[PDB]
Amino acid sequence: EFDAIKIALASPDMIRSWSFGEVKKPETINYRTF
Amino acid sequence: ARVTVQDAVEKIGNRFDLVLVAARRARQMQVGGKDPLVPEENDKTTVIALREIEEGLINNQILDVRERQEQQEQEAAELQAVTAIAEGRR
Amino acid sequence: AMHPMLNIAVRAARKAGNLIAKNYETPDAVEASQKGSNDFVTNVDKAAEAVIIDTIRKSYPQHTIITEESGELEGTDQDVQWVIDPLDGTTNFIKRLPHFAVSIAVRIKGRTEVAVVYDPMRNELFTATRGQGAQLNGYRLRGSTARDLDGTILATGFPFKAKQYATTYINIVGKLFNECADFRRTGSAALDLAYVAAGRVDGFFEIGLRPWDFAAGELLVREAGGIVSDFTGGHNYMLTGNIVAGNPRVVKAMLANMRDELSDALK
Amino acid sequence: MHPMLNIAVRAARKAGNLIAKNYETPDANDFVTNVDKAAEAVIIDTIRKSYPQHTIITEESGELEGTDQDVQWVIDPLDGTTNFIKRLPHFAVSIAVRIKGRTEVAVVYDPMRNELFTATRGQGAQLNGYRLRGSTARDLDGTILATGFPFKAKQYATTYINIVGKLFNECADFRRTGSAALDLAYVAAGRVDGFFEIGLRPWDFAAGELLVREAGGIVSDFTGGHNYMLTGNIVAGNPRVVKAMLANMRDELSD
Ligand SMILES: [Mg+2]
Ligand SMILES: [Mg+2]
């Protein structure tokens, strides 16, 4: 599937491209309803 | 009966190519199994391949030419069949 | 839930697109007039722009509005802008070519927050809100996962308003045809951007585009994994109107290929 | 003109139904050819049941004959395959029935927008009950060109590029949805003024050329000849724009 590995910095556009959204609230899981 | 591989590596002067070609032949004799040339003694296909190697009748060239002969027979038969179908459709 | 301003915008775009479709099946009611180069503008543009402005002011009587016709209607506030194109590809709607869309996006503090384009002929509704992504009629949008300039499809536009670059442009396309597979040309910038974000075409580029012809699509391709840039890798594309967009690999490859063919006027 | 057209329309109906059905298995290069073969096969069944005497001509199966070799069925079950490969919904089925060394029946059906253009020689080409009256342009002023980049004929790449460069210097704008048959249908229905492409094939334009000619238009090759049937070099549209295009495009050709 490949024959090499490239590595470098990630432009903010690149990072925002990876993401599928933006996390905004810190709390993870409600305990009264998992 | 396999305890050593020295005869094999003598017939193929490299253990690496030895195990490669022998694994190829064993895969031949295990899936879509070609009948093992040397009469087996109810053994696994691996040692059967090693024995066929060390006896002096399997190697890289022999496997390749057998594959090519199979290709030739297969293509001839299927092309005859496709020509028959071509006449059948007209 | 659903972003509020996004909901208002999509309702307005729905009404505008219904009016568009209504005007479509009547090749008599269209009464256009030429304004630029090889393109008309119709009364339908004015009708749809009016409907959109009214629907917006209903639930937002103070937001600033931007449109090709009305220029910039400065509402009592000036931080929330609504960039509107009641029609992308008016040339096609003239010839009734069933490929066009309405486009509506919202800028907050200069940053595009929500955006929608709407193709009424196929009833396609590309929505996209920042930090949550882009959707096509309820499916996510990730853009073409192609990794190189091979086998890709390249959407583009010919500068019918700035034909001077044509020659240069031609060379560009020529150079690109050395590697890419095929091109695409629909005369609709917004739908090109959408298709890019839709993963239908694996890359888009255009020389000299209007600001309100991408400000909705650019957020789509952004939140659909793709990136946008000018032809020199910078962010000035909003002023030059020179756009390239697509997944990062194909955009990088296109920029590397075009670094030479391009002209210094564009950079 | 009624029974042949009805049979062809039903065949295109079944083809489009199966195509749209299979269009809903999202996947992210072979299964497209599989559903292509399936639509071609159900088309073949339609040919075998109704009129088993005619002969079939497909890009895939070559030519499969029966007894009536005078009636050739040129059926492309898909044009612009790459679009359906990429889920871009611009593709159609193109049925053609040639009789006595000449095309007589033509049908092009997009199942997405449900566009069903029919054409019988002489009596013309209809769409859903409407008559396609070609384009109204008399020259290359402000017109649109259904232009096609030769992604299979890369030998004429630079020549074609110079040609389209001269054109865009003279003409207004291009369009390319990546579907030759639908491009021909559209230039036939006045949706785009002129059309021209390089290196096409009979199973592609077999119906579209008739759709165009029945719409007050013409179809020719880059030299006004009539060998575009096999040379794959086609220019089409109402005669005014075709003349205005040839007069500019002749002097930079290679064939
Ligand atoms: Mg506009
Ligand atoms: Mg085909």
Side-chain angles (χ1 to χ4, degrees), chain C residues 45 68 84-90 212-213:
Chain C
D45 194 328
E68 48 187 56
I84 314 294
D85 181 8
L87 213 62
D88 179 14
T90 78
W212 42 74
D213 290 19

Side-chain angles (χ1 to χ4, degrees), chain D residues 68-85:
Chain D
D68 194 328
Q69 299 188 356
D70 206 8
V71 195
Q72 305 100 18
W73 278 41
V74 174
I75 319 297
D76 193 311
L78 179 56
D79 181 38
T81 72
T82 180
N83 304 326
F84 189 83
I85 300 189

